[PDB]
Amino acid sequence: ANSERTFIAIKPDGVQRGLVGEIIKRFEQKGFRLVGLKFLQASEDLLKEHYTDLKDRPFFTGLVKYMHSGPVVAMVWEGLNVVKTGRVMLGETNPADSKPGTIRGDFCIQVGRNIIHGSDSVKSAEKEISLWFQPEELVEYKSCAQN
Amino acid sequence: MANSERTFIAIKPDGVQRGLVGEIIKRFEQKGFRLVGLKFLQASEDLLKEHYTDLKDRPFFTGLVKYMHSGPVVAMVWEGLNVVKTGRVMLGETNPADSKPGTIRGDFCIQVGRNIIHGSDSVKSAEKEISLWFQPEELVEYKSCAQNWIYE
Amino acid sequence: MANSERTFIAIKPDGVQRGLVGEIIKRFEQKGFRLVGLKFLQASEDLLKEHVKYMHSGPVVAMVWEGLNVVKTGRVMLGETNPADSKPGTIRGDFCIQVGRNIIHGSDSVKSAEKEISLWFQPEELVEYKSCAQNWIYE
Amino acid sequence: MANSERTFIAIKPDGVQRGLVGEIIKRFEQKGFRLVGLKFLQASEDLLKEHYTDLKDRPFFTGLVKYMHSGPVVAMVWEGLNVVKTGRVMLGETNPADSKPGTIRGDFCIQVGRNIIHGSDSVKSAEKEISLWFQPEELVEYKSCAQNWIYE
Amino acid sequence: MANSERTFIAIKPDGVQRGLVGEIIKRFEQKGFRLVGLKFLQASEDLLKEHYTDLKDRPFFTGLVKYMHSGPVVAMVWEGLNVVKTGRVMLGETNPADSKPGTIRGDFCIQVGRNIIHGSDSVKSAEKEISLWFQPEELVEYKSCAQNWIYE
Amino acid sequence: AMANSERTFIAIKPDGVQRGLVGEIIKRFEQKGFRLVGLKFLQASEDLLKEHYTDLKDRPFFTGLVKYMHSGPVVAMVWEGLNVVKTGRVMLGETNPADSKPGTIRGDFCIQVGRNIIHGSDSVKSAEKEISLWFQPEELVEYKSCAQNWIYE
Ligand SMILES: Nc1ncnc2c1ncn2[C@@H]1O[C@H](COP(=O)(O)OP(=O)(O)O)[C@@H](O)[C@H]1O
Ligand SMILES: Nc1ncnc2c1ncn2[C@@H]1O[C@H](COP(=O)(O)OP(=O)(O)O)[C@@H](O)[C@H]1O
Ligand SMILES: Nc1ncnc2c1ncn2[C@@H]1O[C@H](COP(=O)(O)OP(=O)(O)O)[C@@H](O)[C@H]1O
Ligand SMILES: Nc1ncnc2c1ncn2[C@@H]1O[C@H](COP(=O)(O)OP(=O)(O)O)[C@@H](O)[C@H]1O
Ligand SMILES: Nc1ncnc2c1ncn2[C@@H]1O[C@H](COP(=O)(O)OP(=O)(O)O)[C@@H](O)[C@H]1O
């Protein structure tokens, strides 16, 4: 359980508003280990697969186009309960319901521009990780402290 | 439009005296709200009693006005989607002991009589407080750049 | 005297070794509590504080903070005892992962605070001073 | 009287647009200077040409006034010992590429035409800038509790 | 054209291990530079020997390569006016003891053998280092909204 | 060899404490990589302060300096690291805060030379004198951190 991994993606608005370092800092100071990190403009096919459970939803077409309008930071973090805690750190889906102290609570307002994505479960994490990262891009090392 | 709601935020004299003006403003800037009005003044007793007119019959009303008059305040107007209620969440609760960490009052103050900040509790009180503290000429209009990334 | 309530906060070795001492003290200063005691030591015979090896393996920063409801609010600022339910914005919510390797301790109650303060601090180490912003904190 | 020196500090439109108002204010508050005046406005073209009258024959003067008029600015007056000279040191240099890390311009901007902030370069120019931008009632007098620990 | 200059910035393994990645990135974001490339990897010894090829005859070369290979590094490309020279200024000096407070090396490290960050020293070095560490398809290309307020 | 075990004495003056800057100052030394060795909180007596500032006893500001340093509690610290004495002074700034640059403690947080919030040993000689004056040897704690492997080669 100490080696659980989650997928975190900084959406284009978050990149455009200069929030990459702030977001990464919150995961670092929390104690989670950085495993994968890349910067890319996600293709429309990749995004449709990423949000496949929401294709019939009314906001899907605009969601895929907005996630394609700019580059994203794709990340993998490792640690105990990182999936659930990552979701807690992110906030709620609607930033209006995200508490102060959370990433979405502190830094954004509207649900269509909520700066960050996080996996909802281990099953979604393993699917998102293998979708966004090849296995050789995931680094394994012993981060300090921890123990 | 919904993305044009406005609220009134005031940094109370204890928040100014303790050097919290920048910290408070920064929270509204980084959240994505747009600064519309900003002034710095020592509010008169008449202005404060009209501001707190719904509390005229509370036992703490006289002490409230005297403390709000004991020093300068920062009066502000912030604009954005749901800015009134979201502003209240960012401030915390009336009693800072009920304000959770991460809120302005939860992080920076202790006692209900010195809660450093005020925020409009409703849209109707907001426009009432805005017009009370600001003239229409003092409210600035500008399209910031990141609104394409703040709103759809 | 209401505003004169005191609590005992201890930074455990993981907090010290991860460089969080100043960050933790800052959260109490910016909140408005008054620093009363502050010392640095490797603790032995910790069998009185608890009712032991990890607290003896390294250094502990022991503090005494004063203010209205400092015991209750101090525990709010630390976060829940498990870091998995601790909210972002709290000390444990921001910096802590698991329960065993905890970074910080805070007094459970006023009665516990009085006991822990008397055990860890001599009376000569508790400094009384009037801070300037305390009349802007209290009514 | 030396501890009562005042300077004029203005956050330019790019500074407001990029959300640096609270950050800039925080640096002056944490330094120990006293906030005296604070207002938010879109400066008229006459006010800006008067503000930059010593540069009217420069090739960039026209673009400077237009850019300064392109958005709202935050006008400020700060008080303290050597606040004019120290204010310039905290801002950095005219070209952000010459501004050192730790200063406002060094930390936050890149090119001279977009250097987010203005500060008076002398007591004389500060006196003129403060009168040009502020009315006398907009300057607030108060004693902060910090001053006994800031000045001997 | 000048505003499209690019530099290579690497966070060294000690910087990654001490939890400084976000701090370092934030200094480049808040300054106004545009992130162009970003990757996380454990660099091979041959990559590291080519990167520091001008130092192959230095007595510390073997220890430098081993240390740079002992953990994963964060590789980055940043774009902006004078980003190469300004990146050096933000980094500090080779010896952290000569790096001023406010710089990355001056704030965050102590020993020359563990100075947490690398940055290109020249435009020629940056072009060599960028193509050494990145492939062209990894260099992302976009119009940051916050760019009409950074550049004239 | 033991160059990384050099120690300095840093004291947060009463104005630094009263203005709520204790956490800010400690953080700068922590994030730099220096190791906290000693830490205490006390209202230093006049006899202690006069010994601490003995080289200044004939200066015009000596009596005011001792009185102000006694008017409230100070945070006394010992920090350890390579060249921590000289580097600590750089992190502090100059005697006059008006000559202290942004990014330094005195440059960011204070204004006047008489209220410069912090003290730091000006030499290795001064440091061992100041450390023993304010601290007994059993108050100096020993530990090694995970970061030491990444701060020093
Ligand atoms: N009502 C909506 N309008 C526009 N976009 C939405 C709406 N609801 C969700 N989205 C977008 O779809 C993304 C995925 O939503 P979902 O997976 O249900 O929540 P979460 O973001 O917590 O995983 C969100 O990040 C958001 O940007
Ligand atoms: N019991 C009390 N004693 C002293 N002051 C109080 C008390 N209750 C409220 N106040 C002050 O009156 C102000 C207005 O009260 P109210 O509008 O009910 O709270 P809020 O400001 O959270 O909306 C508060 O900001 C607080 O500073
Ligand atoms: N060569 C230039 N190109 C574009 N803008 C300039 C140039 N020189 C100065 N400016 C702008 O005009 C303002 C006033 O210039 P000056 O008073 O000399 O600098 P400072 O504001 O640092 O005192 C500057 O802050 C800068 O924004
Ligand atoms: N004297 C030295 N001893 C050990 N390592 C060194 C020494 N000089 C340089 N290095 C290492 O080699 C790297 C490259 O050296 P150089 O290119 O001269 O410095 P810079 O990184 O400042 O451009 C440095 O960042 C440092 O980590
Ligand atoms: N001219 C002065 N007036 C008042 N106090 C002073 C003056 N010069 C120095 N002091 C105080 O005495 C302390 C010791 O001075 P000194 O050791 O020479 O400087 P530093 O503290 O930078 O080493 C200073 O930190 C300062 O607080």
Author numbering:
A (entry chain D): 2 to 148
B (entry chain F), D (entry chain C), E (entry chain A): 1 to 152
C (entry chain E): 1 to 51, 65 to 152
F (entry chain B): 0 to 152
Quote the paper.
In mammals, the most abundant and best-studied NDPKs are NME1 and NME2 (hereafter abbreviated NME1/2), which are closely related isoforms (88% sequence identity) with similar functional attributes and localization in the cytosol and nucleus. NME1/2 are hexameric enzymes that catalyze the reaction XTP + YDP ⇆ XDP + YTP by first transferring the γ-phosphoryl group from XTP (usually ATP) to residue His118, and then from the phosphohistidine to YDP, where Y is any of the four common (deoxy)nucleosides. Briefly, each NME1 subunit within the D3-symmetric hexamer comprises an antiparallel four-stranded β sheet flanked on either side by a layer of helices. In this study, we showed that NME1 binds AcCoA and CoA with similar affinity via a binding mode distinct from that of canonical ADP and ATP substrates and critically dependent on the CoA 3′ phosphate group.
